[PDB]
Amino acid sequence: GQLEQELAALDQEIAALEQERAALEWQIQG
């Protein structure tokens, strides 16, 4: 269904942002 596709696209977008947050949380330790 369309809703399930949107949910997957939403998780993809959150993942990409959480990856940025991960990299930032590393550099802030150095």
Least gap, CB of 26 to other proteins (angstroms)? 10
Long-range contacts of 1-7 (CB under 8 A, 24+ apart): none
The two three-digit tokens of residue 3, written as one number? 């809703």
Of residues 1-30, which lie at the interface with other proteins (CB under 8 A)? 1, 3-4, 6-7, 10-11, 13-14, 17-18, 20-21, 24-25, 27-28
Torsional sign, CA 13, 16, 19, 21? negative
Applying CB under 8 A, which residues contact other proteins?
1, 3-4, 6-7, 10-11, 13-14, 17-18, 20-21, 24-25, 27-28
